[PDB]
Write a protein that binds this ligand. Structure first.
Ligand SMILES: O=c1ccn([C@@H]2O[C@H](COP(=O)(O)OP(=O)(O)C[C@H]3O[C@H](CO)[C@H](O)[C@H](O)[C@H]3O)[C@@H](O)[C@H]2O)c(=O)[nH]1
Ligand SMILES: O=c1ccn([C@@H]2O[C@H](COP(=O)(O)OP(=O)(O)C[C@H]3O[C@H](CO)[C@H](O)[C@H](O)[C@H]3O)[C@@H](O)[C@H]2O)c(=O)[nH]1
Ligand SMILES: [Mn+2]
Ligand SMILES: [Mn+2]
Lengths: 278, 278
């Protein structure tokens, strides 16, 4: 049950005035594509706080990638879901190497030890953590660690299932997408199919939908392994196959996954929110 | 559980090409606003058929308004949710005056007798029909009878909760909206509040959300009656208050509720789908 919003004073949306004319803001299956200028964060914050929303954030830091945790976590504290309940789940082979990061109120961090070695992340999110996540959070967000938050990443992303546009391909034709192209792989997508190329570095959704996605991708990767084939972009290839066949209910623009060193700062990006570390 | 979509060949959505530049296609709370050119109906038909979606359509035809049923139903057969399961619920004081209309396969009509007399429709949808609707349909759509379908009205509208832009106000400033303006009414909205003016002639959603809306509006109307006040636009005033405080998850453009005699055919409307009868 969703309680009433309180009175709020904000600018009237005008039907004969788009908030962005330069970009596609809705997919052909009626999922919002999230860009700056498409959302009033005050309305969204109200809606999600009234539900006492808890967001889980999963991040893997294996072997040398533990070095990325300090900046990742410290910048998440500045920019990720501030004001909402957050539970970080840090999966690592080196629990002692996790930096001691000071957290804002209503935020917690759990260190989960895993083995060091493709299949780890999807299997770990689904098989091992299924019951924990269902009990502890409403939404799960799954991200790469070799990253930093530079600007707001908030409840505008939350939805039953989301992917993020890969920053190298958002302006590309589908034949150029680096989908798995061998018909022998479960991740196979023909040259005449595909909506978008989604990056494996940022996806999420409700716990139920994330468990469905990660289970399906893990199962598909196991089939590929049994058949002696490894998809071109590993779990990302499978994520793309899944999101082709199960359309996401929001798509995040490349504001949400950017590499300034490789791609600069195009006019079409009003904010660079979550960016690659060199 | 949502099964995989089959392979489909369709045009690639291009992020740097909006499908409409002339109109707002998403609200500031990230609800799609449904216009022609924003959706691929083949994708949506697949998604909803894979769920074996059943749509209930409620319509009241009381006193002289029984005369509108023949055209309403015959044009609904041509244009409303064709290919999907439909259950019409015709509420009337004159069951014998309901025309015998031939229905396509997978479609059924129930005649529900009510008393003849504001409060009827909201109370009838909520209090009397609650259990029936939950058992029989997935979505409910609630419309005026003094109307005809001229073009496609399909699963693109379906969502947990939707309203439709009133055709007289979609280009208007909020101070001009005919909201209830007396603070003594439960439907009261101040001059500095409001997103849109929604028409009482076309709203809907999941059964659960429609029951919530109609219950809340019926309760609010009963409070008003006890306080000796009747909102300016009756149940529409209350519908507007409800949708201000509980944001709809889609908004239908005025393609979905038009009056050609009063308003002509503006360039911004590529289709006139559901229109007033003179
Ligand atoms: O030893 C490890 C190795 C991985 N990891 C974990 O796995 C995540 C993904 O790997 P990586 O970021 O290297 O992929 P990226 O290189 O960012 C993968 C991305 O860039 C590619 C080019 O390098 C392509 O553009 C591809 O499409 C894109 O997904 C990493 O962030 C860590 O959370 C770990 O903890 N220890
Ligand atoms: O004797 C009756 C009376 C009503 N009804 C039923 O109630 C529905 C609404 O009434 P109506 O269409 O007259 O309102 P409208 O006049 O279309 C109401 C609309 O137009 C107004 C101007 O006339 C304003 O623009 C207002 O904002 C808008 O909602 C009608 O379609 C029938 O299903 C019935 O069965 N028998
Ligand atoms: Mn990475
Ligand atoms: Mn009417």
């Amino acid at each position: 049950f969703m309680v009433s919003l309180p009175r709020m004073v904000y600018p009237q949306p005008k039907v004969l005035t788009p908030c962005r004319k330069d970009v596609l803001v809705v997919t052909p299956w009626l999922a919002p594509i999230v860009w700056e200028g498409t959302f009033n964060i005050d309305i969204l914050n109200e809606q999600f706080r009234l539900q006492n929303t808890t967001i889980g954030l999963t991040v893997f830091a294996i072997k040398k990638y533990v070095a990325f945790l300090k900046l990742f976590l410290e910048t998440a504290e500045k920019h990720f879901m501030v004001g909402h309940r957050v539970h970080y789940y840090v999966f690592t082979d080196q629990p002692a190497a996790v930096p001691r990061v000071t957290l804002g109120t209503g935020r917690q961090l759990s260190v989960l030890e895993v083995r060091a070695y493709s299949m780890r992340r999807m299997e770990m999110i689904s098989d091992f953590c299924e019951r924990r996540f269902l009990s502890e959070v409403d939404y799960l967000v799954c991200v790469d660690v070799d990253m930093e938050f530079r600007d707001h990443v908030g409840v505008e992303i939350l939805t039953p299932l989301f992917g993020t546009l890969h920053p190298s391909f958002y302006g590309s034709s589908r034949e150029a997408f680096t989908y798995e192209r061998r018909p022998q792989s479960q991740a196979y997508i023909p040259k005449d199919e595909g909506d978008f190329y989604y990056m494996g570095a940022f996806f999420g959704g409700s716990v139920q939908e994330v468990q469905r996605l990660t289970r399906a991708c893990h199962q598909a990767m196991m089939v590929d392994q049994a058949n002696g084939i490894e998809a071109v972009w590993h779990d990302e290839s499978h994520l793309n196959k899944y999101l082709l066949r199960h359309k996401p209910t929001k798509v995040l623009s490349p504001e949400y996954l950017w590499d300034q060193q490789l791609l600069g700062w195009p006019a079409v990006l009003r904010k660079l929110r979550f960016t690659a570390v060199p």
